[PDB]
Design a protein around this ligand. Structure first.
Ligand SMILES: [Ca+2]
Lengths: 238, 234
């Protein structure tokens, strides 16, 4: 049975994902930035309203993952905060200017994260030396890695993704980027244990007066369909 | 005595702004989203390192200001958080579908805000009736409003801003959108009490293996404070 993780940009979307079969949620803010740390209000809101596992992303800004000491100070505090709020895991990633995992920094994040299941995000796809990196993530105690096989979308990086899976058992490899109902079977047939999807859609602004404004939300039906595909596939596997 | 407020997307940028003359900082995250609520980590960081007044923006997402019940619940908790952390003010705004200030929900925010000085942001430039909105803001107890005179840039809307300033003594009118060292004197001559500027630029990523970051320009901040100082010192 493959694990279905849905990226949500609001508490309502995470709830919709939960009610539609999602096994886990990656909680983010700012879709146009690729996902940034949610405000404390959103975090607390989700802890009070969402029951399935929620992993908040810890990312102060978009762009690269070579944070300054100031941004890093905030990141450590956010990690401690997410742990204290009771989340079972979190998502983050830090690299040096050459694309190598910043080990000293990641170790400090792991220490602050405590028992939390940490996901090293797509910073992995911007890094050099995939295997060497996986070995080091395993050394840090990273639970899983969100990756597209270092390609524009996970389907293109499918052969690489399979390589990662066959290289080490840990961290768990989670396919992400462009993963949708139409191509889910590719990942399942390849033996991917966890898949990440935005199950995104655009809802028009209800704004009647003006002078973009569409909201990026989770399509509940899309989530259910993907979970359906996952259940049948695991079933077809006898 | 014109007040210079700088929009900063990081603690370090806020510090740079402070070291260069900024009288106040609007703290935001997500420059590409037009500015969203900063995380607790960033907020705590600024409280321990920045001394001039800082007003964090409270905005869960980009786009319109007609938030869902779920988003609004988060907004109230963030107002409560910013207040509890001791910031002297905050920036936010909620509108109904017809371009009117959402009074029932804005009232709940004011209640949660307590003594904090609340700035109604550019949601104001999306309102159908500016003078009536100013009235509504004063009714709410709003301290100041960030506006471009309802134009694409504040200079273009300057004549409108001058009209707003004389209308009433409701919230303070703070000119924003396109304000920079180059055109600052226009707003000062117009009689604007407070001005807002991001005074920044997108910085290239230092990555040597394969990419931008929005940072404040401390020189620009310093130049603007100079213009302000010289203005009422001429
Ligand atoms: Ca390698």
């Amino acid at each position: 049975m493959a694990l279905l993780e849905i990226c949500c940009y609001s508490m309502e979307c995470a709830l919709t994902a939960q009610q539609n079969g999602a096994d886990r949620v990656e909680l983010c803010a700012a879709p146009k930035e690729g996902g940034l740390t949610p405000s404390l209000g959103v975090l607390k809101s989700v802890r009070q309203r969402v029951t399935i596992p929620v992993h908040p992303i810890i990312r102060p800004r978009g762009g690269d993952f070579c944070y300054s000491d100031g941004e890093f100070a905030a990141i450590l505090e956010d990690v401690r905060t997410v742990r204290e709020l009771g989340f079972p895991g979190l998502v983050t990633g830090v690299l040096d200017v050459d694309g190598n995992v910043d080990m000293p920094r990641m170790e400090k994040i792991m220490a602050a994260a405590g028992p939390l299941a940490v996901t090293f995000h797509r910073a992995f796809d911007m890094c050099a030396n995939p295997l060497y990196t996986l070995n080091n993530l395993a050394e840090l105690g990273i639970a899983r890695v969100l990756t597209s096989g270092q390609k524009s979308d996970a389907l293109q990086g499918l052969s690489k993704i399979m390589e990662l899976i066959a290289h080490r058992d840990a961290p768990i490899i989670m396919a992400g980027a462009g993963v949708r109902a139409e191509n889910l079977h590719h990942f399942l047939d390849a033996g991917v244990l966890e898949v990440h999807s935005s199950a995104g859609a655009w809802q028009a602004s209800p704004m009647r007066y003006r002078n973009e404004y569409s909201r990026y939300i989770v399509d509940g039906a899309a989530v259910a369909e993907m979970k359906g595909i996952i259940e049948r596939h695991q079933a077809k596997l006898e």
